[PDB]
Ligand binder design. Structure first.
Ligand SMILES: Nc1ncnc2c1ncn2[C@@H]1O[C@H](COP(=O)(O)O)[C@@H](OP(=O)(O)O)[C@H]1O
Ligand SMILES: Nc1ncnc2c1ncn2[C@@H]1O[C@H](COP(=O)(O)O)[C@@H](OP(=O)(O)O)[C@H]1O
Lengths: 289, 289
């Protein structure tokens, strides 16, 4: 139906369809040269996906327009009636392949860890993530009713949203980067200095580009450019899946705008809770630039 | 009629219409805050005009699309039947104004020198200029028959083309920069490092821009961007004036491509002649990067 309730799998709340996609996924075979883009929802998946695809296409914009980003970078656990699962889309994806997922480590196909697949993880401060997720819940009909912002924020703090706990997600993948090749990025860093981050990515994937081509990538991976690029702004998907009139996928693309949504009371409650949850974590985020 | 013969004024060969525009121009009054873009044809007039207008509009692309570049930056000596002379277009151009000319110092309105108007001069190596001019002569019907490339090159060496001698032009304006505020740029330098040159321009016009806005200007003043921008590629002008099917205004935008046009014999003849003409000149160009 519409806005169906989430379904729990191994302690993780998942969109019904995606939970179903986990069955077939057990057969997925990762290749040594795959590159997995991993993120907790709304942390910059699309953004880093466009960056990586441009790098992979040698900065050739025309090639990057060959199809929408969700087509160029198969969504691993994706599934929907009548549409090939991301796992199927991956059957005709040429190597080297770029893959996307939001799956907690507990649901991640073991094959990706055994094959030592290079991982590009992107994290974003929890407040901007929460707000971005609140609006995403509204336009992406596949999600359950978000309720009021206060109610959503409450569910967000206990990980009772699609894909579970933000706190758990950013922490476990941070810890994984110790026994697995993982480049851990920050949405805020990318906002601060795009080129600097794009250069780290280039080094991580062991590639090189002319200084001029890099500046070219920077420009076409900017919010302004990606907002207007129909191959990255998701405006080509059926309104039944994503309704941009309710809230555009490319919303604001800023770091620190959570401040116009969080009330003073919610902020104090959130900070308190946040300190307990991130206590023993060496990770350090920036709520604004 | 069509492709009429050039008309000489004070030793300078000029397009008939432009020579006529010199009469009214004697009344032109320069303002202390004007900025004059000066160049020998095909040295990067349009290129630096877009750069300056973007800087003047604070990097706002929308504002830079308000009209074609020849509208935003009035062509001082321009004239054509039924169209307001550049001098007229300058009556409704708000200050601070950006102005364009190709006029040798001998025909330049005295008012511009007396008012100490800041000048941005751009020079380009003679070989790329000649070749670029040869193709421009073909598409811009206002010019007389260019003849064969060999014939044109011959007329170019003796300054028997529209606006006279390239050698005289680049040299006199270079000498003017000693008693007048003049920022003397090189097309090749801009090709080499766009940002570096855009930063020199910013300093010259005593303005500043956020690092990010500067990178923005760089991208939108790139050949690729200006070629597709109808407000800078001249595709909006009547085909009777400019026929892009014969040769696009935005041709190649490269430094060093003269080598695929000049024959070995023409090259040796040109170098010999060039050495005599540039003997006592401290100016130094680069034929390639
Ligand atoms: N090029 C870009 N620069 C900055 N932010 C971008 C961006 N492209 C997408 N985003 C932002 O990334 C968030 C979506 O994340 P993901 O792609 O993982 O779902 C949205 O944030 P907001 O909702 O705050 O605007 C979206 O605006
Ligand atoms: N952004 C840009 N970068 C490099 N060259 C540019 C440019 N914009 C215009 N040009 C080039 O400048 C020359 C025209 O000069 P002007 O504007 O003074 O008439 C043409 O050179 P070519 O004919 O070699 O391609 C044109 O291609």
């Amino acid at each position: 139906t519409s806005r169906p309730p989430l379904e729990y799998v191994k302690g993780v709340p998942l969109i019904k369809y995606f939970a179903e996609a986990l069955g077939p996924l057990q057969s997925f075979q990762a290749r040594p040269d795959d590159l997995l883009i991993s993120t907790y929802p709304k942390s910059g998946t699309t953004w880093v996906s466009q960056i990586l695809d441009m790098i992979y296409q040698g900065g050739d914009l025309e090639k990057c327009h060959r199809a929408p980003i969700f087509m160029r970078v198969p969504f691993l656990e994706f599934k929907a009636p009548g549409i090939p699962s991301g796992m199927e889309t991956l059957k005709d994806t040429p190597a080297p392949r770029l893959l996307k997922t939001h799956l907690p480590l507990a649901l991640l196909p073991q094959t990706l860890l055994d094959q030592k697949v290079k991982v590009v993880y992107v994290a974003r401060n929890a407040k901007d993530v929460a707000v971005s997720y609140y609006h995403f819940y509204h336009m992406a009909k596949v999600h359950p009713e978000p309720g009021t912002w206060d109610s959503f924020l409450e569910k967000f703090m206990v990980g009772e949203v699609s894909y579970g706990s933000w706190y758990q997600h950013v922490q476990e993948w941070w810890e994984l980067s110790r026994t697995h090749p993982v480049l851990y990025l920050f949405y805020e860093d990318m906002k601060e200095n795009p080129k600097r981050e794009i250069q780290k990515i280039l080094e991580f994937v062991g590639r090189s580009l002319p200084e001029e081509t890099v500046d070219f990538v920077v420009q076409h991976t900017s919010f302004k450019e990606m907002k207007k690029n129909p191959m990255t702004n998701y405006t080509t998907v059926p309104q039944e899946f994503m309704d941009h009139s309710i809230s555009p996928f490319m919303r604001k693309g800023m770091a620190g705008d959570w401040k116009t949504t969080f009330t003073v009371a919610q902020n104090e409650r959130f900070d308190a809770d946040y300190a307990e949850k991130m206590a023993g974590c060496s990770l350090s985020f920036r709520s604004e630039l």
